[PDB]
Amino acid sequence: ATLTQTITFFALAAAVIIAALGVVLLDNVVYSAFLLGGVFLSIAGLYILMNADFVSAAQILIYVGAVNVLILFAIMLVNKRETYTPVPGRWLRQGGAAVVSLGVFALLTKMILQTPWQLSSVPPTPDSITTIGQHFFSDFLLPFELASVLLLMALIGAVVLARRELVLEPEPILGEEVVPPLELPERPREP
Amino acid sequence: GVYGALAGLYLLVVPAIVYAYLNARWYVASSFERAFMYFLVTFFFPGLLLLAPFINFRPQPRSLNS
Amino acid sequence: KIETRTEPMVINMGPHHPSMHGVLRLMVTLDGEDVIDCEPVIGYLHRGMEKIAENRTNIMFIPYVSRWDYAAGMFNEAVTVNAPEKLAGIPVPKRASYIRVIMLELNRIANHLLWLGPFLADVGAQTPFFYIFREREYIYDLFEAATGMRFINNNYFRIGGVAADLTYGWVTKCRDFCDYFLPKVDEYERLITNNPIFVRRLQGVGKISREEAINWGLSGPMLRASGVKWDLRKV
Amino acid sequence: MQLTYVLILAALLFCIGIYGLVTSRNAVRVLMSIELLLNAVNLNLIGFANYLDGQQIKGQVFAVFVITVAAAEAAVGLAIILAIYRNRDTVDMEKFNLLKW
Amino acid sequence: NAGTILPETILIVTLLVVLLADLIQGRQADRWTPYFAIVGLGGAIATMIPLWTQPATISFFGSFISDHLSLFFRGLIALSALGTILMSIRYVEQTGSSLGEFMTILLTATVGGMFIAGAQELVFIFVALETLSIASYLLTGYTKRDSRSNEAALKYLLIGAASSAIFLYGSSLLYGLSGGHTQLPAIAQALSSESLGLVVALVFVIAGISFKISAVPFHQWTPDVYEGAPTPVVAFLSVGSKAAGFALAIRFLTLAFPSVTDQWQLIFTVLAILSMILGNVVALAQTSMKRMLAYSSIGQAGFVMIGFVVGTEAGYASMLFYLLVYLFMNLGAFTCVILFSLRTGTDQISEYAGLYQKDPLLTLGLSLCLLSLGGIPPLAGFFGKIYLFWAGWQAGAYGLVLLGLLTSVISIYYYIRVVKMMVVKEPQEMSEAVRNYPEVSWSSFGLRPLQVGLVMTVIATSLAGILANPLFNLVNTAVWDVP
Amino acid sequence: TGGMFSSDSYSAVRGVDKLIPVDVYLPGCPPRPEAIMDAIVKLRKKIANEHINERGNLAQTHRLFTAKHKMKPVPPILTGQYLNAPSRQAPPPALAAAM
Amino acid sequence: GYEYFLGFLIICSLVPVLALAASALLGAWIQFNVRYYMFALVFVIFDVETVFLYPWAVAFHQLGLLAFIEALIFIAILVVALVYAWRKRALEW
Amino acid sequence: XXXXXXXXXXXXXXXXXXXXXAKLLWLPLPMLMMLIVATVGVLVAVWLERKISAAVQQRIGPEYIGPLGILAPLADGLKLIFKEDVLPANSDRWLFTLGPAVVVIPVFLSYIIVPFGQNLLISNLAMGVFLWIALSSIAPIGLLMAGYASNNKYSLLGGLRAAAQSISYEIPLALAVLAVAMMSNGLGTVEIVEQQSQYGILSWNVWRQPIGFLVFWIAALAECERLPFDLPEAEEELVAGYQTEYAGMKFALFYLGAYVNLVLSALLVSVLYFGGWSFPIPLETIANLLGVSETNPFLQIAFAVLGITMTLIKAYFFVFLAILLRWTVPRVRIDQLLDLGWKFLLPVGLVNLLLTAGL
Amino acid sequence: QITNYAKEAVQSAKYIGQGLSVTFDHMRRRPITVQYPYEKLIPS
C-alpha cells in the first residue's frame, strides 16, 4: 500500500503543475478557466493523501464547486472584450518575468531541502472533523467570527460593484460644480 | 457471496416464476395487486433482465370461430 | 464563436418549432428578459390554395378546404359550400342545416380541445395534455361514423345540403359523449382559476384593449376576450 | 511522498502563479494565477500539518480560512473585473496603464 | 473572556445597524445613519479608556493580547474611521452611491484593522489582514464608474491579493519552521537559530507588512490608488490602513522574530532610506493634490520607520507619537482637499490659487496641516520629527537622521508650493474660483461634520505639539508592552 | 408525391424524396394513427435487414466542385426589427395630407 | 478500504494523458446580463458559510452552550447577508 | 522545459503495472457486486420512468420489447452507443467530449458512499454525506462546458441557465444534510443509518426532521429530475438547452447519467431520513407484501437479497415518488425556480438547522 | 419570521400531498389504449 500511495502522489503532483502550466500559458482564456479546476481537483486529491479529508472536501465544494464556477460565469461575460490579442504588446518583457519566478523557485528549493524540519512521529488525526471544529470554538474562535464579517462585507461590496444602477440612472442629484453620478468629484484635467 | 446457492435461486429460478405471474395477471390485475406487480419487477430485476429474451408476452392466436 | 456583447440579443425561434400549431418562425429580440421586438416569419406552409381554387370546380375543391384550419376541419367546408349556395340562391333543407350545426359545434369543441392541450402544457401542467387527446378521440369517432376519415378530409358539406345523413347509433352517442364531456369542461376551468400559480402567468400577459382589437382586426375568442361581444353566429 | 516533495510542489505552484501574475495580459488570468498562489500556500499548510503536529492539526484549520479568504478575494475581484469591463470595453491589462506621463 | 474585544464588538453591532437601516429605511437612513456610526466609533474609543488601566491580559486562548500597544493602535484606526465618516458624509452622498453601504465597507476595514493590532496567532493575523485588505478594494472602487477608480481598485487588488499570498507563504513557513505553533510567542521559543528558512519567512512577511505601510519597492499601488480612489478612502488608507500595517510590524517582527532582529532592522533601514528619498522627491514633481499627498504618505512612512530600525524604548515611542500626530495632519489636509473638491471639481494644484479671501477656513486649515507635514514649528508635525530624531541620535543611526533632515527640507518645498498657490498668489492669478467660488454655507448636508472635522484636526495640529506632554506619557506607557 | 398539391401549386415540394432519402412511405390524407404504426412496423422490419458491416455506406460522400461567380450579394431582407422599424412610428409625409 | 485502490486506479489510468499533456505545452450575441455572476456571487458567500457549519454540527453535542451562542453570531450575521441580497435585487433574475 | 522530461519519467515507471494489473478489474467481489447493483439501480429507474409515467397517462408503456419493457432501458441505451456520434462543425473538441464527463463522473464517484445492504458496504469513509455534496458541485462546471463547447447561442443560454439552477439548490441541499449530520453526530453514512437502527421505523430521521426531509426532497429533484428542469425548452428560452448538440454516446451520459443522479438522490433520502437497510419483523403474515407461507424458499431468498439490497429497494420508492411528482407540480419557470432555492429553501433550511439545535 | 418560515412550508407540502393522491388515483384506472398489431381497431 506504500507503492500505490507513492506513485499516486506523482500522478497528482504532475496533474496539478500541468494544469497550472495550462492555466498560465494557454492562449484561450476559457481553456484556462476549466484547467483551473484541474489545478484545484488535484490539490483536493492531494489532501486525501495528506489525511485532510475535510479540507479536501472543502476544496471541491468551494474552489471547484463555487470559485471555479464564478470564474467561468465571469469568463463568459467578457468574451467580446478583445479579439485583437497583441501578444507582443510593446516589448519582450514577457520573458523578463521568466527569471524572477525561477529565481524564487531556486531560492525556495535551496531552503526546503536544507532546512531541518521537526517531523513529529505522533499518530495523527483520529477522525479530524471533531478536531477541526473544536478549534473553531476554542483556539481559532476569533478568526471564525471575523470570517463571517469578511463574507458579509465581500457580499456588500461585490453586489454594489457589480449591480446595474436601474434605480435612478440619470440622477446628478445636485451641484456646486457639476459632478456626474457614480463618479468621484475629482474630475480629470490635463495641465 | 456464494456462486449460485443463494444467488442462482434469485437469478434463475424465481424470475421464471414471476414471469408465470407477470404474464398471467398484469393487465387483468387489481389496483392493490398491481402495486405488488411493480415491486416484483423492481426487486427481481437482475433476474428478470437475464431471462428476458427467453420469454415472450405476445398474446395467443385468436380462435376465429366463424 | 459565440461572444458576449452588450447589445440586445436576437434569438431565432426557428421554423422547426416543436409545437402543434404548425411551422412558425419568430425573430424575437431580447433585452435580458424583456422582449423589445419580434417579427413573425410565416408562409412556411404556403401551398397556394387561392391559386388551386381557380382550377378546381366546387366538388373538386371541397376535399382541399379542410386543411387551412386543420384543427377545425369542417369549419373550412362550411364557408366553401356556402359561397356558391348563397350566390346561386340554392335552398338548403332544415334537416341538412341542423346536421351542419351539429357538425360545426362538434368541430368547435375539437378545435378548442386541440388548442387547450398544448396551451396547458405551455403554461405549466402537462398531465392534462394526454387526457384532452382522449376527449378529442371521441369526437374523432363521431366524425368517422357520419363522415369518412377522422377529423379532416371529411367531405360532409355540399352545396345543396350535406353529403349523407347520420348513422343509426349516432344521436344516442353524442348523448353518451356530450353528457360525459360537459362534466370535464368545468374540470378544465378549475385547473387555471384554481392553483394561482397559473393566474400569475395569464393576468396582464398579452393584454390587448377593446379599441385596439377592432382596429387590428380580430375575431372569435380573441376579439370577444376584450369585451366586444361580436359573434357571427349571432350577428 | 515525503515532506520535501509537498513543499517543492507548493513552491513550484507559487512559482507558476508568479509567472501567471506578471506575464498574463487578460485581467481574469491574473486572478486565476492568484488562486495558484493561495493553493500553493495551502499545500505547505497541510503538508506541514500532516508531518508536523498531526495530533492537534492547526495548519488544516488555517488552510480552511485561506480557502474562505481566496473565495472572498476572487468574488470581490471578479466584481472589479466586471466594473472595469462595464466602462472600459476590454479586459486587457496593457490598456489599464492610464496613470502615465 | 470576551471583554478585551469590547472596543471592536461595539463596532460590529454599529456595523450591522448602519447596514440594516439601509435595507429598512432605504436612503432615508442616510439622514441619520452616519451620526450613529460616529457615536458607535465614539463609544468604541470611550471603552478603551477603562481598558487602559487593566494589566494587559492575553485573551481568547492566546490568540489576542489587550496590552497598551494594542489599545493605542486600536484608537488610531477607530479615530481614522471617525474622521473618514466626517469627510464621506457628503462626498459619497454627492456621488449618488448609498451612504449606508459605504459605512458598512468602511467599518469592516476598521474592525479588520482594530483586530490586527491585538492579533497574536498566524490565523487571526491573516484573517484580520484580509478584512482590512478586501474592504479596501471595495472602497477604492466604490464609485465604480470612473475608469480611474475602477483602475485603482483593479491595480490594488492584483498587488493586494498577491502580497497577501507572499505574506501567507511566510506565515505558512512559520507554521513549519516551528513544530506547528500558530502562536507568535510560541514561535519565538521554537525558532532561534537564524537559518535560511527563517530569513525567507521574514522577507515574505515584510513583503506584506510593508504593503500596507508602503515602503518604495512595495509602494507602487499607493500613488495610482490615491488619485483614483474616493478621497475619504484615501484619507483612511493613509492613516488607518497604515497604522494597522505598523501595528502588524511591531507585533510580528518583535514577538515572532526576536532572534532575527539585526536582519529586519537592516531591511527596514533600506525601506526607510528609500522611502524618504523616493517619497519626498517624486512628490516634488506633482500636479494633482491627492497624488502629491500620495508620495507624501510614502515619504512620511519612512520617518516612522526611523524609530522602527533603532529598536529602543524611545524608538518605538517616536514611531507611535509620530503616527498619532500624522492622524491629525492627513485627516486635516484631506478634509480641506475634500472640502475644496466639493465646492469645485478638479482638485489639483494651480487650481487652488487665489484663495484665503474666498475660503479662509479652508486656507488656514490646509496650510497649517500641510506646514506641519513639513515639520515647521511650533506645529504638531515639528515635534513629531524632533522626537523621531532625538530617538534617532540616541542609538547610532546618524545617517538616517541626516537623511531624515535633508529630505524634510525637500519636503518643505512641495508643501509650501500649495501654500504658495493659496495665500501668495494675487487675486488676478486664480484659475478656478475667479468669481466662481460658491460662497461657502456650512448649512447643507454633510458639510457641518466636514467643518467640525476640519476645525478639530487643526486644533490637534496647532496645539498637539505644544501640549504634547500627556501624549508623550500616553505613548511611553505603550512601549513597555513591546519585547 | 406532394399529393393534392401535386397538380397546380407554385410552392410545394412534390414528394419529400426530392430532398431526403426515405425508407418507408405511407399513403393517406391523413393516415389513421393505426396506419402510421403499420409504417413503424414496416420500418422495424427494415432495421433488422441492416448488416453491421455496412456502417461505412451510411456516410455521405463529398464529390466537391467549386466555381466562381459574379452575382451581387444582397443585404439580408429579414432583419430582426419589426416594431421599432423606422416606418411604424408615424405615417410619412406626402401621405398624411390626403388623410 | 477498497475505494483507495480504486481511487488509485482512476488516476493510474490517466497517467498516459499526463504524458501527452506535457507534450502539448512543450452575429452571435449573448447579452451581458449580470445575473450569471450575481447568482454565483451569493453562492460563493453561502457555500463558504455552510462549510464552516460542518465542523460545528458534527461536534455539536461535544462543545457546549457557549460554543452554540458563538455559532449563532456566525449564522445570524449571514442572515443579514442573505436579506441584503433580497432587498438589493442581487438574486432577482 | 525541465518538466518536459518529468511527465514521461514516472509514466513508464508506473506503466509496468498499469498494464500488468489492468486485467484484474473489480478484483474485490463486493466491488463487482456493487456495480451490478449500481447498474440495475439505474436500469430500473429508466423502466420505472416509462412505466409509471404511462400509468398516470393511462397508456401502457413499453410492451413488445422484452417481456414488458424490461429491455427498454437497455435498447434505449444501446442505440446511443451504436449511433455515429459526430461533433458539430465549428465547435471545440476537448471541451465537447469532457462536457458530459464532468456532469456525470461526480454522480458516479459519489456512488461509493451509499451503504445499501447490511453486508454490502464498499468503504465507510470519514465523511460521505459531505463528500457527496462536495462532488456534486463539480456538475455545474460540466453544464458550463457543455454549453460553451457546443458553440451555438441557445446552448450557452441553456448552459448558463442549467448551471445557475444547480448553483441555487446545492446550498439548501447542504443544510438539509446538516440537519441529519447534527442528529447523527457525524457524517459517516454507516453511522447515520446506525442512529436509525434503534427502533426500526419510529427512530427514522423523517420522523425527527419533517421539514429537513422536505428541504432535501425539493433540492434533490431540482438537480436531477425532469420536473423543475428547463432542458425541455417548452418555454422556448433556448432551442433544447445545453443537451442540444449532444448525440450518440455523449448524449447517453446526459441521458442515462441523469438517472444515476436520480437514484443516488433517492439512495440518500433512504439513508438520511429513512433508515438505510432497516425494516420491520421478517416472520410476518401473507399481507406483508410477500408470499403466503411463513417460511418459504422464496422468502429465504428474499431476505438474503434484501440483506444485500434494502436501501436501494427503499430508493426504488422515492424514484417512484419523483415520477409521481412530475405529473403533479406545474413545470415552473426559471424566475420562480431561483426564487425558491434562495428565498424559500435557504431560510427554511437554515431555520431547520437551528431547530435541529436547541435555539 | 423564524416561526413564519417553517410554517410557510406546511401550507404547500400538504397541498402537494393531496396532489399526489390524485395522480396515484390516475393509476387506478385501466389503461384505455389500443395495442395496435394485436388489437386493431375496427374501421367505421
UniProtKB/Swiss-Prot annotation, chain B:
Subcellular location: Cellular thylakoid membrane
Gene Ontology, cellular component aspect: plasma membrane-derived thylakoid membrane
Catalytic activity: a plastoquinone + NADH + (n+1) H(+)(in) = a plastoquinol + NAD(+) + n H(+)(out); a plastoquinone + NADPH + (n+1) H(+)(in) = a plastoquinol + NADP(+) + n H(+)(out)
Residue intervals passing through the bilayer: 1-18, 35-55
GO MF terms held by the record: oxidoreductase activity, acting on NAD(P)H, quinone or similar compound as acceptor; quinone binding
Pfam families the UniProt entry points to: NdhL
Function comment: NDH-1 shuttles electrons from an unknown electron donor, via FMN and iron-sulfur (Fe-S) centers, to quinones in the respiratory and/or the photosynthetic chain. The immediate electron acceptor for the enzyme in this species is believed to be plastoquinone. Couples the redox reaction to proton translocation, and thus conserves the redox energy in a proton gradient. Cyanobacterial NDH-1 also plays a role in inorganic carbon-concentration.
Record-given protein name: NAD(P)H-quinone oxidoreductase subunit L
Gene coding for it: ndhL
From Swiss-Prot, chain C:
Enzyme Commission code: 7.1.1.-
Domain of life: Bacteria
UniProt subcellular location: Cellular thylakoid membrane
GO molecular function, a single term: oxidoreductase activity, acting on NAD(P)H, quinone or similar compound as acceptor
A Gene Ontology biological process term: photosynthesis, light reaction
Membrane topology field: Peripheral membrane protein
UniProt GO cellular component terms: plasma membrane-derived thylakoid membrane
Keyword annotations from UniProtKB, A to Z: Membrane, NAD, NADP, Plastoquinone, Quinone, Thylakoid, Translocase, Transport
Keyword Cell cycle carried by entry: no
Main subcellular localisation: membrane
Subunit structure: NDH-1 can be composed of about 15 different subunits; different subcomplexes with different compositions have been identified which probably have different functions.
Function: NDH-1 shuttles electrons from an unknown electron donor, via FMN and iron-sulfur (Fe-S) centers, to quinones in the respiratory and/or the photosynthetic chain. The immediate electron acceptor for the enzyme in this species is believed to be plastoquinone. Couples the redox reaction to proton translocation, and thus conserves the redox energy in a proton gradient. Cyanobacterial NDH-1 also plays a role in inorganic carbon-concentration.
Family: Belongs to the complex I 49 kDa subunit family.
Name of the featured protein: NAD(P)H-quinone oxidoreductase subunit H
Lineage: Bacteria, Bacillati, Cyanobacteriota, Cyanophyceae, Acaryochloridales
Span covered, complete protein: 3 to 237 of 394
Swiss-Prot record, chain E:
EC top class, as a word: translocase
TM region positions: 4-24, 32-52, 69-89, 99-118, 122-141, 157-177, 196-216, 230-250, 264-284, 292-312, 320-340, 364-384, 386-406, 452-472
Bilayer topology term: Multi-pass membrane protein
Superkingdom of this protein's organism: Bacteria
Entry's Gene Ontology cellular component terms: plasma membrane-derived thylakoid membrane
Quaternary structure note: NDH-1 can be composed of about 15 different subunits; different subcomplexes with different compositions have been identified which probably have different functions.
Record-given protein name: NAD(P)H-quinone oxidoreductase subunit 2
Source species of the chain: Thermosynechococcus vestitus (strain NIES-2133 / IAM M-273 / BP-1)
Taxonomic placement: Bacteria, Bacillati, Cyanobacteriota, Cyanophyceae, Acaryochloridales
Curated annotation (Swiss-Prot), chain F:
Location(s) in or outside the cell: Cellular thylakoid membrane
Assembly mode: NDH-1 can be composed of about 15 different subunits; different subcomplexes with different compositions have been identified which probably have different functions.
Superkingdom to which the source organism belongs: Bacteria
Gene name, Swiss-Prot/TrEMBL: ndhK
Residues represented out of the complete protein: 120 to 218 of 237
Cited function: NDH-1 shuttles electrons from an unknown electron donor, via FMN and iron-sulfur (Fe-S) centers, to quinones in the respiratory and/or the photosynthetic chain. The immediate electron acceptor for the enzyme in this species is believed to be plastoquinone. Couples the redox reaction to proton translocation, and thus conserves the redox energy in a proton gradient. Cyanobacterial NDH-1 also plays a role in inorganic carbon-concentration.
Similarity field: Belongs to the complex I 20 kDa subunit family.
Residue positions binding [4Fe-4S] cluster: 29
Name of the protein in question: NAD(P)H-quinone oxidoreductase subunit K
